[PDB]
Design a protein around this ligand. Structure first.
Ligand SMILES: O=c1[nH]cnc2c1ncn2[C@@H]1O[C@H](CO)[C@@H](O)[C@H]1O
Ligand SMILES: O=c1[nH]cnc2c1ncn2[C@@H]1O[C@H](CO)[C@@H](O)[C@H]1O
Ligand SMILES: O=c1[nH]cnc2c1ncn2[C@@H]1O[C@H](CO)[C@@H](O)[C@H]1O
Ligand SMILES: O=c1[nH]cnc2c1ncn2[C@@H]1O[C@H](CO)[C@@H](O)[C@H]1O
Lengths: 403, 407, 402, 403
């Protein structure tokens, strides 16, 4: 009833839009008995009601952009007063056009029983972002950086992104400190890249892997001098953000030491199978599946929550920044985070003119309680796409890259 | 936000389990979370917490049994029915504490200090308890052993256990919302099962032939067959008179077809209004009508829900359709409107296998993945006909059947 | 749907409130500091609100038409009561908006009471429009509540009677004698007696229904004795056909079990001895002693226990029954509030019973006060949700004005 | 933030805890009129143990709360985040057992332990604590009792007993009136009773104080022996003002009040308020008051919310502290707060040894959405009692003062 365990463990903006859309739906749309005559009329009016609302939100976003532009780098944006937990909008969003296009496909205005869904709005928001970047191309601030979530139909589109002179970064929560591992699982991307004759080697090496959220950076290399292809680790000094440089190594190791100890305690208390392994690396410590032998989500969630709470009461850990991740059957504790990794890549690709958030798009699937490495953090560093299927990713990439 | 559209859709969620979750949360926050951070004696805390959880489950056991006795009456209500008003009938005693202690070993529930006992935890405990019961009745003098196991249709590690079930002398039926009126389709769909059963040496033919397919929810019945003169196997259609329940035989054909005709017209209206692509096609059969994806192609989720909600509401205002029970299903990316229901299908099978001594609900177990808003063909209706297992993964089915059939 | 009170267990108003929340956030809160746009902001907000109410009017009309023969509104709001009359929602909003300045608010959304006020104003508006036409269904019966075991409403009751409108007071007290209600309503009968401007014939159209629908009394003025007061109308005249088939033994068995149940509750709750149990012909109840009163938790415990207990008692379900814990009293009565209103509708004109569309129940018991709540009165006719005596007076003034 | 819809999380948290034994051991046993004593006894035992557990949690929080006080958090703060500060130990079980005897909470089978049940228990426990310290050797006994004075009798005797018992009594109001006359005219009878009461020394008589504008004006009862002059006398600010308040800029104070006065004048035109409603401006406060004419609770809350959020975006107001009150028909904007008001009185009575929060009990009837001057703010300065009825105040004071 009243959950006493509620605070021990949703996108408000989207639910907000859903509420605004539901009011005309229940009043005008819910007119089920109707196809005898007035359902063209009902659909038409309902479509207009929805379109108007999205157009109103368009202006609210643009007002927020302007307010945030001048007053940031204490007032509040209108939209921020309406939606307190809303994230920054680095780009304009043609919501009305996006809706009308999606309504063409899925006939949302033509429904009388099923209100505009969370997925409906999510698709509109994603379509709007893509539409924005395509608009700049036929003029603006075009898309310079696309990032993906590591922790196949997508592989070709990655290659063409690179050919179109767009930097591609793969952000993973994996704490592996050796290139070799990433070469072993990103095999297909590496060899298909390598084996492709079209791409100049310059564009070929614009592919990067930001491991440990923002702990390790690897870049693609092609040395057919040796016919050696794969990923080369980049020295910290080139890609490390200034604030991260200030972190003491002692606090880093102390943080990782305390984390690894906490993991082992959790292991014993939870009496986890011995096939479950705790892996410690240079900038990361994590727990991994075994043999077949996996971990329950409650166990994964217990681990992340325990790690976050303990470390947040650990002084070395607060003098730095850390992230936790429990997406798959693995829980990773890494130094840094999603936002830091994306912004590091922005500076890395062009130090003289760092890639702006307005020119950055993070196609991510970790908009969930996957930990502090959630893709909501990525909204701090740039524009994002919210994908729920690999096909969704391909669809979005296809329309983006369509001439 | 006050969702003004809430009541337009089905938002059924197992109140009994949520009720159990709420009870377990009180010892959790006062004993588990109150000793979060305690580096020393974790074992003591886990033991006290587990004991508190176990006591609660044993209390619920008692409530369940009392209800079973108070439902043997037939208007008062069981004490449990007062606590949880939407509770279903318990055809069988549930060893909940034993099931909790077993799952607590696997899932380590009592050891957690941050994450409370979950819905899935209770679901696992409830399912394990249902299995544990039937395993107890096997050796028992006057125990009611499991006679019928039912599955949901609409290579595969379930097939061996289905074969093992049949060999163990247990009747197995598959209830599919598909409305196809030919045995050929189900032979094509379930070719993996029929081939393995055909190739199974350890199972006598009488036990093999104890495999049935309930086409529609209760519209068509098919039985496995193995010709003794020729190497021909597959599925045979059974005449209506042998398996059709009395009330179903009382149903008028004209109302049946009026319903299906109305449903078919309603489907094409929806097709136009939602401007669905031309390959989405609408298929009409003898006792069922449905809309299926085509190729060049598929239907959105919300569109599928729009269809079943439309069909259900419209037909529930159709007089011939109230004289004759019907069902809708949008689980896959198809929507099928079938005459009858899942409840009817299970009890039809209960009668068919042994007409003279019909299989009781206490001897029936439906393994279902459709305990969801999948229309009126949901597995909550199967709780009317007998005991159920709530499965969320195919691996759960395998594990559940493994525990049951383990010697 | 639990029968036991764990937390604070009208959906239509909350549904409307949710609707009104959309223009509030998108068009009002967005303009909190736009102090020169106050004219345009308020105008747009007022139109947005008014458009919603106009839309709900249509859905209500659809519900009425459908119920004349679920409705969309029933699908949207499953706990919605029947609308016996159409309501002018848009105008009611605009009128109340002038007084309350709802559209000018940027920090506070349209409230529950805002809508309740608008709904009440709409109901009164409807009758007034019907009135001037006279052609339409005019208000013939107004019912009030005095259910519990200084008043400016009295002159308006008198004005209602002089306007040829029948006035009934429905009460859950369940006392079986006229003298008690004469004393409780002394101010009303004195004022009515002292009124020279009202014909005795019209004075006689004042009735009181005790025990929800168990006892009926009428106002009388006889020249011979030269007094006045209340005379109990015989059962044959006002009893509904459903109630006539009710067996006396079931009635007695119901009350006897209820009285027994009350006595154990006294024991177990260790209630003070000053607390007494009163038994009447068609009612049994627990009343506060002497100040010695009962906690609301205790009163709720009593009503919930009785309802659950009696609804599992075969004689009681061959019967209808009601419980009421409004004040610091709990009464178990044979009748029901809907039955009382329906009985009065027949009593005044047996040939052509007063239609629900010509009936208005001004009630203050739209609360968890047991099965005797005023939501039951919505079954028998139109209603008015009042929170203050001033509200009643205000609503009655608008109703009876030129 | 804006308000769409309409308590105390700690009480709700305890209610949810007590609800679990209720459903299983009480609701289940309805219809069982035999065995009811046994059922009641067990149910009582279950409830009591929960309270004893919560007692322990409080003692732990208090000791953790010795770490800082004007990282991490108490386990109670994790479970209930919006929980206030407990300056004293609370005998919850003893209080429950007493309240269960009076209210028969454990005997109920259909009605769970209510919000009011717990509230009474918490209030009783607070009283119980101070009574034991009166017993104990040199225990931190009650030294300051504060009351609310509202804005534009059985309680009077108990105040006198408090004063005669050597307990300092203060009355805090949101009224912005800066003249002693208004309060001699508002607190008549009490002054007369104190003047007429021969059984009280005038030294103890003077321990009665009035805090106006929450913490803006201080008036102390005076009684000249030879000239028959009695009433309230304003105390000079340097004597009772807290240091932080002394450092406040008069300009910022004035600028804040002037902004509020214009905001108030804006609101009355916007809301088209009647001309009978008058706006009152004082030295340390500005307010809106009813006419000869009254204001809706929506209008009252609109004004408070508007004023509150507006001034929070006003820099001079940020550099000061302000409070708002809409309990009565009036809406007052006063410089300071109830918290600052109580604490100022704590130093005023005895500057060499300021009265501690553990020695201060605030009996208040404003634990509601009354604005920033609510009694929840008083929990920052000391112990409190939640009052819903005037008779509750009388009964509570009686039990506190009984011997
Ligand atoms: O609260 C938010 N919800 C959705 N998108 C947001 C939000 N805040 C900032 N953005 C941005 O809006 C675009 C919509 O797809 C994305 O670029 C997302 O990052
Ligand atoms: O409300 C219910 N929730 C869970 N199971 C129920 C319910 N009602 C009857 N049963 C039965 O209890 C067993 C354990 O899940 C299953 O057999 C189920 O069908
Ligand atoms: O769910 C309802 N809420 C409020 N009023 C209702 C409802 N159902 C029917 N009516 C009627 O609407 C008028 C306005 O208050 C009243 O006449 C009431 O009886
Ligand atoms: O969240 C709280 N709820 C109730 N009381 C609290 C809370 N926080 C601190 N105290 C203190 O506990 C005593 C009992 O009510 C009071 O002294 C109150 O100020």
């Amino acid at each position: 009833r009243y959950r006493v365990e509620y605070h021990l463990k949703k996108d408000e903006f989207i639910d907000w839009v859903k509420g605004l859309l539901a009011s005309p739906f229940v009043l005008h749309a819910v007119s089920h008995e109707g196809d005898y005559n007035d359902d063209l009329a009902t659909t038409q009016r309902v479509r207009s009601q929805y379109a108007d609302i999205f157009k109103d939100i368009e202006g609210l976003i643009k007002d927020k952009i302007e307010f945030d532009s001048r007053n940031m780098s204490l007032g509040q944006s209108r939209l921020n007063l309406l939606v307190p937990s809303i994230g920054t909008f680095f780009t304009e969003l043609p919501l009305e056009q996006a809706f009308l296009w999606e309504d063409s496909q899925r006939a949302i205005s033509a429904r009388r029983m099923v209100a505009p869904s969370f997925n409906d709005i999510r698709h509109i928001l994603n379509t709007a972002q893509i539409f924005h970047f395509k608009k700049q191309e036929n003029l603006g601030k075009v898309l310079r950086l696309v990032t993906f979530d590591g922790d196949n139909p997508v592989i070709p589109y990655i290659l063409k992104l690179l050919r179109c002179g767009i930097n591609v970064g793969i952000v993973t929560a994996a704490g592996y400190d050796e290139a070799g591992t990433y070469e072993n699982r990103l095999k297909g991307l590496i060899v298909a890249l390598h084996d492709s004759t079209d791409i100049p080697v310059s564009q070929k090496q614009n592919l990067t892997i930001m491991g440990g959220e923002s702990s390790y950076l690897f870049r693609y290399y092609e040395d057919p001098e040796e016919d050696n292809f794969g990923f080369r680790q980049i020295d910290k000094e080139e890609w490390l953000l200034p604030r991260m440089k200030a972190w003491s190594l002692e606090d880093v190791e102390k943080t990782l030491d305390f984390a690894e100890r906490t993991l082992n305690r959790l292991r014993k208390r939870l009496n986890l199978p011995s096939e479950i392994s705790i892996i410690r690396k240079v900038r990361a410590v994590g727990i991994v599946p075994g043999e077949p032998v996996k971990l329950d989500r409650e166990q994964l969630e217990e681990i992340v929550l325990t790690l976050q709470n303990t470390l947040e009461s650990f002084a070395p850990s607060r003098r730095i920044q850390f992230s936790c991740f429990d997406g798959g059957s693995d829980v990773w504790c890494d130094i840094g985070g999603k936002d830091l990794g994306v912004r590091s890549l922005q500076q890395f690709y062009n130090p003289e003119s760092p890639i702006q958030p307005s020119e950055t798009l993070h196609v991510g699937d970790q908009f969930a309680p996957v930990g502090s490495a959630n893709d909501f953090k990525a909204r701090l560093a740039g524009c994002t796409l919210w994908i729920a299927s690999p096909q969704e990713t391909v669809n979005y990439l296809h329309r983006l890259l369509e001439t």
